[PDB]
Ligand binder design. Structure first.
Ligand SMILES: CCCCCCCCCCCCCC(=O)OC[C@H](COP(=O)(O)OCC(O)COP(=O)(O)OC[C@@H](COC(=O)CCCCCCCCCCCCC)OC(=O)CCCCCCCCCCCCC)OC(=O)CCCCCCCCCCCCC
Ligand code: 07D
Ligand code: 07D
Ligand code: 07D
Ligand SMILES: CC[C@H]1c2cc3[nH]c4c(c3C)C(=O)[C@H](C(=O)OC)c4c3nc(cc4[nH]c(cc(n2)[C@@H]1C)c(C(C)=O)c4C)[C@@H](C)[C@@H]3CCC(=O)OC/C=C(\C)CCC[C@H](C)CCC[C@H](C)CCCC(C)C
Ligand SMILES: CC[C@H]1c2cc3[nH]c4c(c3C)C(=O)[C@H](C(=O)OC)c4c3nc(cc4[nH]c(cc(n2)[C@@H]1C)c(C(C)=O)c4C)[C@@H](C)[C@@H]3CCC(=O)OC/C=C(\C)CCC[C@H](C)CCC[C@H](C)CCCC(C)C
Ligand SMILES: COC1=C(OC)C(=O)C(C/C=C(\C)CC/C=C(\C)CC/C=C(\C)CC/C=C(\C)CC/C=C(\C)CC/C=C(\C)CC/C=C(\C)CC/C=C(\C)CC/C=C(\C)CCC=C(C)C)=C(C)C1=O
Ligand SMILES: COC1=C(OC)C(=O)C(C/C=C(\C)CC/C=C(\C)CC/C=C(\C)CC/C=C(\C)CC/C=C(\C)CC/C=C(\C)CC/C=C(\C)CC/C=C(\C)CC/C=C(\C)CCC=C(C)C)=C(C)C1=O
Ligand SMILES: CCCCCCCC/C=C/CCCCCCCC(=O)O[C@H](COC(=O)CCCCCCCCCCCCCCC)COP(=O)(O)OC[C@@H](O)CO
Ligand SMILES: COC(C)(C)C/C=C/C(C)=C/C=C/C(C)=C/C=C/C(C)=C/C=C\C=C(C)\C=C\C=C(C)\C=C\C=C(C)\C=C\CC(C)(C)OC
Ligand SMILES: [Cl-]
Ligand SMILES: [Fe+3]
Lengths: 47, 44, 274, 305, 257, 47, 46, 48, 44, 47, 46, 47, 46, 46, 47
């Protein structure tokens, strides 16, 4: 699998991956905040 | 990128992604213990 | 830092005022005396907008709104808390935009190019000045200016349009719209043609003026050519703004009724007024 | 005053000529003419036009659509030429009412609108194929057809794709001057003020941005036109002082700049995104958002009423 | 009402709007990459070493060279990474990176500031037919001035102070774009010297019967120093740049020089 | 009649003719579908 | 204007076999649809 | 009528014909879906 | 493109389209067994 | 039949087919989701 | 069928494929969240 | 993992971190100010 | 701290500083004129 | 930590800091003025 | 790839390691104090 780093420059790969993973993580935290059950800051009951 | 550099990068990359996934798995386990996210037939 | 070709152009001179004192760069930006006065008015007006947000009911960016004085003030200066803030921001914004135009002139002088850009930007300034100064002065109150707020200026557009029953029927507004749509059409065509000539496709050589002219002759039977399209594209954008200004100087200062009812002159023309 | 290069003072003439293309079924039609006033703004040559099979198809479909509209407009004033002129802007051909769904309505109750709309749609899509194939014949990129596809996407969204999502044609656009303006007014009011539709806000930003960019770019190329800047593809393939000074004016003004090629990509994308974001704003209306002001209140655009 | 909902608060229109913002950010990155196909990397203003303030987006900042294929069979790369020499015939008024340069000698002949030009190809622009595009009417017999217009030939050439620089002796026309690009002026001083005058640096004044080509850019003394061209019937892109830059410098330097 | 094919290019004739006849045929089928009596798919009664 | 006879004849064989297959499948499709629901109404409609 | 290929280019013929046939088929399927009797997905009764 | 490689492409193309149609045919069969899509006289 | 690949570029053919088949497939799945009977995610009864 | 990598550049293929697969996956998860039965975050009863 | 500075310019990494961390921190403080429970300036009761 | 003038030109710094201080002074006077307690020209009671 | 000035030009750094810190300070004072408890110019009771 | 030596990379990595540990140490202290003031994981009955 190490051959992938000859197809792609590791510098571009790491910055691209870090950008992708941050935006994905940020989306998931905002999605949870949009729910009642998982918004930890407002903290509704599990009725 | 030389084969020797690619193999060295892959070694560090493999170690790093497994640490990242290991920490994330621990984060998910704690969140599951707090509030699970698969509802039963009656919902939550 | 500099572009690979920049250094040879960074010569002294071309300032309108202030001499050598301001004739320098901060990174990529040229300063000049109108750079300083741009910053003066920009910081003042921006901080006064943020102050108006602190005075107002919400920090939600979309909802922030600094409002002109009540029409009951007429053209008097209002107290700061009662619309005077909007008045200071307005004239600071005029100062900032005028400084920006004059700073562009200095940059044109230094580069030996013509003054078309600050001249064209002068129509943006005149459109803003028409909405916040000329129209409310001719209507006799600052309270006819638009409020400075992301949604509230759109609310003012809505309120102002429906004040004349239906703003689509304003004839100058129809012509303004036509020129805005024509500008976007012409820009789409112009961007596409240059890119299609520069990027003919893999294994193809870059095309030149004969091909560029031939594409629009083949498709639509005319080509304005590479110089004409920049003349046209400029004139279209500036004419769209001029007719926008006219449509607003008509609505309120001159014509006060329903725009749908204005068109009834057409149906009353004697050769078909049965 | 120096020469501002707004109008060509002295203009030259030569034998009319154009780039070669492969022989088709149809030659280039018409005798090339020249007009003096077009030669002041731009090139003087009212050149020949290419027809081709796709051109025949598009014009035939389009002519039939225009006849169906025009005949219905004149029929609506009981064939009177005086009342036609008197009422022209107010005349329109209306889509069918909602009870017909997407089937064929009776001719007088919007069936003619459906036929005219289909024929106009087909003509426009054939004109897209024309704009595409004329570029390939000249061995040029297809950028103009793909820009045109964005305009078509809004046109189709207005006329057909949203009706398909709504299940009927009743809120489609009537063919008529003041009628299509009245449709625009009523559509905004029925869905709770289009100012609060964020994709309409995006579409406006790109509409304003297009006029901004063409004012900036048109003024820029004229400012460097005494340095050869109007010869843009030549400047793209061998950077002259005109392209250097255009870049530096904007860099020194606002801190950043394009190239002579890339400014045309900024131009292309802004005009495209105007109609693309427009089309999305139309397709979301009534299908997933029924009142845009209420959506705006939910998402913080306005205080709760 | 539940119609649009994705969660309690989240809905389809909101999701589609953030999908647009993600696309638009990616498009700006693409557009800024294209903007960097000329002039980059950035250099230190004083030393000319490759330096600038950069974040981690530097790694996506400059694109791989695209190759333009020219109809001569030559190519142009963008970025080509060629850059101007660090030394110029001028010195800074103050030692800071942001300071302006003062010309060491005559800036119009030293080609600094608005007299500066790009080192374009020493090749003429070509017609589609492969002939040189920009040529004197003497060599383009199928071209003519439209019968409605004043022909510039034989008119006096006059500066903004009313001194005669010379007379127009030919038009140079662009065969590809079908326009006048230069007037060929025989000078009044050193008679027999001929110089090119960019046509967009002129207008014809015809308020008085002996109509004339007025030139706002430079004064009559400066015409003797207009850059020369190697051939009598064609002009390279570099020679075009050199000539046009010289006149564009007149608005800043002609009352200095 | 054959002299017509020396006056007109047979390819231009057939393309124009095929275009015209398809558009006309399509128009007529759509017109009949826009009627009660002749819309064969809806199939109203002969009352 | 078109192709020389030999390759016109070559093309015409592959064309003719393809169009006959296409029509053959379409005829079978129309037959099955007719058996399901015919599309010519009687005097009283469907 | 093999001489039709002596009259028209087979490559542009096939591209045009394949496109025409798809558009025509798609139109007919859409027209049928717009009817009660022949919309197979909603499948109304013939009301016997 | 040569004759010999055009014949090579045609063989792999023929193999691929038969697999694609085979999977699609099985997909349609399972959907039909769940809910058929040709109604009877009384509809569904 | 293989001569069709002398007439059309195999790379363009595969790109064209893949684009066409995906857009067609996606259309048909969305059509079925609009129906009551075949919307598998909502799963209405065959009453 | 490994000859497909002589038709297509593996580098561009993987970028396009990963872009396609992510957007498809993201679409499918949002579709499920729009449903009552399969929205796991709101978790309605069956 | 000091080898990461053989991939990346340390100056660019610091510029990137400072930019990212400031905007992330500013986002989190603004999110908390939007809540009742964690808006320290308005200081609602833990009802 | 006199070394600061080996980093910044006295003439430029003085004009920039004078510009900054004037904007700051104007801002504060405008802020006070927006208040009840400190609008000296309106002169509300305490 | 003095090695930071071999990475970053002090002149650039000080201009960046001065701007950033002023904008931040001005933001924080305006935030407090928008509150009931900490607006010192209105001076509401606690 | 960054053009700095192994020695400069190791020198930077030492300072970087100390700096990020200090930054994360202050952040951990900040989070502990906020948790003592108002914890941010709700129980089943909410807050
Ligand atoms: C005081 C008053 C301040 C009013 C508000 C002003 C806001 C903007 C800030 C303006 C000042 C920035 C100054 C700066 O960055 O200088 C860098 C330079 C050292 O740099 P360097 O060594 O030469 O290297 C730089 C180079 O490597 C960077 O790369 P590159 O050269 O390729 O690109 C240059 C950058 C420069 O950008 C700018 O200067 C700002 C650009 C304008 C931003 C406007 C944002 C708001 C509008 C909406 C945004 C929208 C975004 C999407 O180029 C760019 O970044 C260009 C990006 C263009 C994106 C265009 C998108 C258009 C979309 C339109 C909307 C469509 C809607 C559908 O500095 C120095 O030399 C040291 C001395 C100066 C220190 C500056 C300290 C900070 C000053 C901050 C001023 C106060 C701000 C509140
Ligand atoms: C995404 C991978 C990578 C990643 C590490 C990274 C991160 C960040 N960058 Mg960036 N960027 C990367 C790559 C890259 N980058 C830029 C540019 C710019 C300029 C102007 C463009 C603009 O409008 O951006 C638009 C958005 C785009 C292009 C996406 C990245 C930025 C985001 C998500 C932050 C947006 C949030 C803000 C509060 C507003 C920031 C300030 C302004 C726009 C003035 C602007 C100052 C800017 C800000 C930041 C910040 C605040 C961050 C944080 C939070 O980490 N970025 C472009 C430019 O011209 O640079 C001189 C350009 O060429 C280019 C490239 C290739
Ligand atoms: C219920 C509402 C009703 C409804 C029926 C309707 C509909 C439509 N209308 Mg309208 N309209 C209504 C009312 C109404 N209508 C207008 C105007 C128009 C113009 C706008 C452009 C323009 O004017 O740009 C005028 C340009 C200006 C004012 C230039 C301003 C910018 C300047 C100085 C620079 C500012 C720079 C900074 C601050 C720097 C910031 C910092 C940094 C970026 C770093 C245009 C022609 C136009 C278009 C359409 C369309 C396409 C439609 C469709 C599709 O239905 N309309 C305005 C005008 O004419 O203003 C002079 C005006 O006031 C007004 C009113 C009240
Ligand atoms: C009471 C009115 C209300 C109010 C709140 C408001 C106000 C304003 N709005 Mg708006 N608008 C309202 C309603 C509303 N608004 C829009 C749209 C826009 C976009 C159009 C972009 C475009 O290029 O259109 C124009 C392009 C089109 C329609 C597509 C290209 C055209 C094609 C392919 C047709 C080719 C033609 C032929 C071959 C000839 C055939 C011949 C014959 C038929 C005889 C644009 C940006 C825009 C501007 C503004 C401004 C400036 C204002 C101001 C200042 O107030 N508005 C459309 C849309 O995209 O909405 C998302 C749309 O549907 C819709 C609606 C219903
Ligand atoms: C006249 C034809 C078109 C045009 C032309 C044009 N605009 C131009 C130019 C040209 C030729 C420039 O050279 C100049 C420029 O530099 O472009 C990058 C500019 C410009 N056009 C701009 C914007 C702009 N142009 C617009 C329109 C148009 N510009 C026309 C369609 C619009 C619209 C319709 O909405 C906008 C927003 C800027 C990007 C730029 C001018 C930058 C400038 O002046 O900078 C100095 C000032 C500041 C940095 C900020 C000052 C802040 C003030 C103190 C407060 C302002 C408050 C305001 C009154 C209220 C805001 C609230 C809103 C919600 C209403
Ligand atoms: C990107 C968004 C912008 C955009 C872009 C755009 N528009 C475009 C393009 C592009 C890039 C094109 O390539 C295309 C074009 O050709 O431009 C020159 C087009 C186009 N944009 C158009 C219009 C248009 N664009 C608009 C807007 C926009 N266009 C946006 C602002 C608007 C509006 C309302 O804002 C309009 C009205 C057209 C001029 C053109 C597409 C022309 C077309 O499709 O024509 C189809 C054919 C007909 C209408 C039929 C005409 C029939 C004749 C009367 C026949 C007469 C002779 C014949 C032989 C008779 C035969 C009789 C027999 C059959 C009996
Ligand atoms: C590198 O450089 C490049 C060039 O060179 C190499 C170029 O060349 C071009 C190409 C650009 C041009 C040739 C000129 C661009 C100019 C404009 C957009 C501004 C003025 C508008 C136009 C020239 C019209 C544009 C549209 C055209 C030419 C039609 C295209 C379509 C067809 C030929 C077929 C279908 C359409 C037809 C037959 C007619 C369409 C309708 C009109 C043109 C409008 C007619 C008017 C009305 C209907 C009346 C409306 C008004 C009314 C009722 C009230 C007022 C009354 C009036 C009479 C007005 C580009 C982009 C370029 O990059
Ligand atoms: C031939 O093809 C062409 C190209 O090229 C080849 C081109 O490129 C372009 C240009 C087009 C593009 C690149 C496409 C993209 C553009 C658009 C879509 C248009 C929209 C534009 C934007 C969104 C950008 C908006 C940004 C703006 C307006 C700039 C904002 C910046 C400032 C206000 C700062 C200005 C700086 C000044 C005046 C001086 C320097 C100052 C600083 C750097 C910062 C502040 C100051 C200090 C730190 C210190 C100094 C302060 C002092 C002395 C005062 C102190 C006191 C105070 C009160 C502050 C075109 C047209 C073209 O046709
Ligand atoms: C780590 C520990 C500390 C040690 C290190 C400390 C020292 C180093 C710090 C540097 C950061 C500060 C300088 C930022 C500018 C540096 C240059 C820059 O552009 O950086 C980007 C951030 O820009 C920027 O935020 C510039 C922002 C300028 C404008 C700021 C306005 C703020 C005020 C209004 C806000 C509200 C507006 C209204 C919102 C509704 C991030 O990189 P990025 O790769 O994308 O660059 C693109 C380039 O790499 C492409 O070639
Ligand atoms: C012969 O001499 C002349 C030319 C003078 C005759 C006179 C002509 C005149 C005067 C014509 C006047 C025309 C006017 C005034 C037209 C105005 C038009 C305007 C302003 C239109 C604006 C917008 C219209 C839109 C966006 C409509 C779009 C409609 C669409 C896309 C409809 C598509 C429908 C389809 C595909 C239908 C499908 C259903 C089928 C047919 C399959 O089954 C029922
Ligand atoms: Cl002029
Ligand atoms: Fe251009």
């Amino acid at each position: 699998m190490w051959r992938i780093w000859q197809l792609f420059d590791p510098r571009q790969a790491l910055v691209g991956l870090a950008t992708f993973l941050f935006v994905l993580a940020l989306l998931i935290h905002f999605i949870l905040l949009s729910t009642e059950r998982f918004n930890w800051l407002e903290g509704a009951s599990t009725k | 990128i030389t084969e020797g550099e690619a193999k060295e990068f892959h070694k560090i990359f493999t170690s790093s992604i497994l640490v990242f996934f290991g920490v994330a798995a621990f984060a998910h386990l704690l969140v599951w213990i707090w509030r699970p996210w698969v509802p039963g037939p009656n919902g939550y | 830092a500099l572009l690979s070709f920049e250094r040879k152009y960074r010569v002294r001179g071309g300032t309108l005022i202030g001499g050598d004192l301001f004739d320098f760069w901060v990174g990529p930006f040229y300063v000049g005396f109108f750079g300083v006065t741009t910053l003066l008015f920009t910081v003042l007006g921006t901080a006064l907008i943020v102050w108006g947000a602190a005075l107002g009911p919400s920090w939600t960016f979309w909802q922030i709104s600094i409002n002109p004085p009540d029409v009951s003030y007429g053209l008097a200066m209002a107290p700061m808390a009662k619309g005077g803030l909007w008045q200071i921001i307005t004239f600071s914004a005029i100062g900032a935009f005028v400084s920006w135009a004059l700073r562009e002139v200095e940059i044109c002088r230094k580069l030996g190019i013509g003054y078309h850009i600050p001249f064209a930007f002068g129509f943006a300034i005149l459109a803003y000045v028409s909405l916040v100064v000329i129209r409310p002065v001719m209507m006799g109150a600052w309270g006819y200016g638009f409020p400075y707020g992301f949604m509230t200026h759109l609310d003012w557009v809505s309120n102002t349009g429906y004040q004349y029953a239906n703003f689509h029927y304003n004839p100058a507004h129809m012509l303004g719209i036509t020129l805005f749509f024509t500008t976007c059409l012409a820009l789409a065509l112009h961007g596409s043609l240059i890119l299609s000539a520069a990027n003919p496709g893999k294994g193809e050589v870059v095309k030149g003026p004969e091909h560029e002219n031939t594409y629009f002759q083949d498709t639509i039977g005319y080509s304005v050519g590479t110089l004409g399209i920049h003349r046209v594209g400029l004139i279209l954008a500036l004419s769209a703004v001029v007719w926008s200004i006219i449509c607003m100087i008509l609505s309120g200062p001159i014509y006060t009724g329903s725009w749908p009812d204005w068109w009834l002159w057409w149906q009353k023309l004697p050769f078909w007024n049965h | 005053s120096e020469y501002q290069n707004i109008l060509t003072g002295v203009q030259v003439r030569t034998a009319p000529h154009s780039a070669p293309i492969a022989k088709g079924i149809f030659p280039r039609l018409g005798k090339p003419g020249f007009s003096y006033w077009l030669g002041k703004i731009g090139d003087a040559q009212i050149g020949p036009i290419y027809l081709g099979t796709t051109g025949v198809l598009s014009l035939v479909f389009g002519f039939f659509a225009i006849e169906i509209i025009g005949f219905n407009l004149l029929a609506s004033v009981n064939w009177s030429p005086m009342e036609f002129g008197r009422q022209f802007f107010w005349l329109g051909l209306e889509p069918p009412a909602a009870e017909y769904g997407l089937g064929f309505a009776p001719l007088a109750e919007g069936g003619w609108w459906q036929i005219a709309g289909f024929f106009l749609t087909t003509s426009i899509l054939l004109w897209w194929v024309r704009m595409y194939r004329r570029a390939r014949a000249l061995k040029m990129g297809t950028h103009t057809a793909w820009a045109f596809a964005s305009a078509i996407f809004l046109f189709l969204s207005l006329g057909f794709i949203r009706p398909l999502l709504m299940g009927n044609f009743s809120e489609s656009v009537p063919f008529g001057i003041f009628p299509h303006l009245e449709w625009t007014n009523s559509f905004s009011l029925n869905y709770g003020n289009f100012f609060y539709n964020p994709f309409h806000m995006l579409s406006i930003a790109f509409l304003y941005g297009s006029a901004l960019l063409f004012a900036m770019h048109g003024a820029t190329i004229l400012a460097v036109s005494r340095l050869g800047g109007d010869r843009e593809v030549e400047q793209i393939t061998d950077r002259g002082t005109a392209a250097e000074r255009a870049a530096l004016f904007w860099r020194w003004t606002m801190g950043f700049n394009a190239t002579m090629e890339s400014i045309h990509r900024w131009a292309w994308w802004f005009a495209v995104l105007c109609t693309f974001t427009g089309a999305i704003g139309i397709l979301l209306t009534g299908t997933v958002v029924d009142n845009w002001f209420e959506w705006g209140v939910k998402h913080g655009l306005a205080p709760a009423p | 009402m539940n119609k649009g909902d994705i969660t309690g608060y989240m809905d389809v229109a909101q999701v589609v709007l953030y999908a647009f913002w993600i696309f638009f950010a990616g498009l700006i990155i693409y557009l800024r990459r294209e903007d960097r196909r000329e002039g980059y990397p950035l250099e230190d203003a004083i030393s000319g070493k490759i330096n600038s303030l950069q974040g981690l987006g530097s790694v996506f900042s400059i694109a791989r060279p695209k190759i333009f294929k020219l109809k001569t069979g030559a190519t142009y790369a963008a970025p080509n990474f060629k850059r101007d020499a660090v030394a110029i015939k001028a010195t800074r008024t103050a030692p800071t990176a942001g300071a302006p340069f003062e010309p060491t000698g005559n800036p119009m002949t030293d080609a600094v500031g608005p007299a500066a030009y790009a080192l374009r190809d020493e090749l003429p622009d070509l017609t589609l037919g492969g002939q040189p595009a920009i040529v004197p009417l003497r060599v383009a017999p199928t071209f003519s001035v439209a019968a409605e217009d004043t022909d510039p030939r034989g008119l006096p050439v006059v500066d903004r102070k009313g001194a005669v620089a010379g007379k127009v002796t030919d038009l140079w026309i662009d065969r590809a774009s079908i326009a006048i690009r230069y007037l060929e002026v025989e000078l009044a001083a050193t008679p027999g010297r001929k110089v090119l005058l960019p046509f967009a640096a002129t207008r014809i004044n015809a308020k008085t019967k002996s109509k004339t080509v007025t030139v706002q850019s430079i004064l009559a003394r400066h015409f003797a120093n207009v850059p020369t061209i190697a051939k009598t019937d064609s002009i390279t892109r570099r020679e075009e740049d050199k000539v046009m830059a010289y006149y564009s410098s007149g608005y800043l330097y002609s009352d200095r020089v």
